[PDB]
């Protein structure tokens, strides 16, 4: 039974909502369990970074997040090859791989390539056993710095550009932005039907010629 000028509402309580309620009373213990697990893992993997392997750069899909950049899941097998790395040992260095990916550009590829090459510069690989065969670092650096990193590795951050001031020429003052947009929508809308009436016009031009 309604009354003077309120809202109309539709609440979703006509079921038995009451056997199935959920309390967030275990919120802190859930936090506490994780730390002791998150610490202990990093103690298990002693010098290795706690966050995990390295992850790549990846742009976000849609028109809304068209512009931003984030961290992905795996380097592709194309871009590894360019670095000269095998898809089997990389998992052991700390490198991530997903082979479901593609590449439909070149400027994406060169960036993640240049990321990998800095990585192996800043890497440190211990020898298995005291002998020092190929790709085994010197004891000097191997003792000084052998410690974990805190947080992610080579973090992703969105850079911007700075187009400096410049003088406005006349080629720009005499540009008609709005009208060009309106023309553009139109041509994309009538691109097909024009040709079809034109083709039919030309397919009767033969009748005019015959």
């Amino acid at each position: 039974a309604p009354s003077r000028n309120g809202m109309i509402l539709k609440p979703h309580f006509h079921k038995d909502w009451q056997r199935r309620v959920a309390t967030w009373f275990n919120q802190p213990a859930r936090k506490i369990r994780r730390r002791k697990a998150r610490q202990a893992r990093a103690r298990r993997i002693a010098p290795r970074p706690a966050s995990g392997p390295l992850r790549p750069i990846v742009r976000c899909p849609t028109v809304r997040y068209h512009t931003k950049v984030r961290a992905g899941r795996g380097f592709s097998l194309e871009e590894l090859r360019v670095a000269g790395i095998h898809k089997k040992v990389a998992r052991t260095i700390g490198i991530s791989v997903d082979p479901r990916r593609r590449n439909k550009s070149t400027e994406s590829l060169q960036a993640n390539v240049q990321r990998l090459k800095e990585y192996r510069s800043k890497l440190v690989l211990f020898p298995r056993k005291p002998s020092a065969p190929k790709k085994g670092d010197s004891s000097a650096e191997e003792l000084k710095l052998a410690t974990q990193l805190t947080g992610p590795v080579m973090p992703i951050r969105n850079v911007f550009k700075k187009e400096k001031a410049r003088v406005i020429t006349e080629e720009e003052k005499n540009f008609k932005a709005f009208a060009s947009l309106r023309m553009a929508r139109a041509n994309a809308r009538l691109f097909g039907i024009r040709a079809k009436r034109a083709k039919e016009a030309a397919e009767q031009d033969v009748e005019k010629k015959k």
Binding site: K15, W17, R20, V21, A22, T23, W24, F25, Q27
Partner: protein
């Protein structure tokens, strides 16, 4: 090799050859019992393709099962209730005959655990399937690293729970714009978190 030539053959289930054979075997099996053991397969390639290796510890049974739908089991019709639910005849059970057959064999043979199955015959009122079974405690299977996954206490009675190829179909599992239930793992679990209210502390 040869298992290919055989394969394209069985894809032609209407030539004079296969019409002959199947008509002949259904005669035969129809005379035997409802459940009996077979010594060896009738579709060897298919069985190899599901995971039948030819060693001792693997088994083949054959099964008969009657066709049709499901009559609502009650007295003389007369379901006591709404007009929507006066339905007794044009009703269609929610699992396939193939998975039904696996179930009988699992219940009759309790130690033996069930791998998968396939089709070999058809008739007006019967339909015949073969079923592939395993003995877990035979040492040939215990000592082989690549098939002792099933000697764990967890892969009991797969047929009773929907975990073969023929059981996984009826549940409805997939990834796309077509399923959207079973996002959790199953229909119940989706129903829960959607019809479950979450009351935080602070709000």
């Amino acid at each position: 090799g040869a298992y290919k030539y055989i394969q394209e053959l069985w894809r032609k289930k209407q030539s004079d050859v296969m019409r002959f054979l199947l008509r002949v075997r259904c005669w035969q099996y129809r005379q035997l019992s409802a459940l009996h053991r077979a010594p060896r397969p009738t579709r060897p390639d298919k069985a190899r393709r599901l995971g039948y290796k030819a060693k001792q510890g693997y088994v083949i049974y054959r099964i008969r099962v009657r066709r049709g739908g499901r009559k609502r089991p009650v007295p003389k019709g007369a379901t006591y209730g709404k007009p929507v639910h006066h339905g007794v005849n044009q009703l269609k059970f929610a699992r396939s005959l193939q998975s039904v057959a696996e179930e009988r064999a699992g219940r009759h043979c309790g130690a033996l655990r069930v791998l998968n199955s396939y089709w070999v015959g058809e008739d007006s009122t019967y339909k015949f399937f073969e079923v592939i079974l395993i003995d877990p405690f035979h040492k040939a299977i215990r000592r082989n690293p690549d098939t002792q996954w099933i000697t764990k206490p967890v892969h009991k009675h797969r047929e009773m729970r929907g975990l073969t190829s023929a059981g996984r179909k009826s549940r409805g599992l997939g990834k796309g714009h077509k399923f959207h239930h079973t996002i959790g793992g199953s229909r119940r679990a989706a129903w829960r978190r959607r019809n479950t209210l979450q009351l935080h502390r602070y709000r």
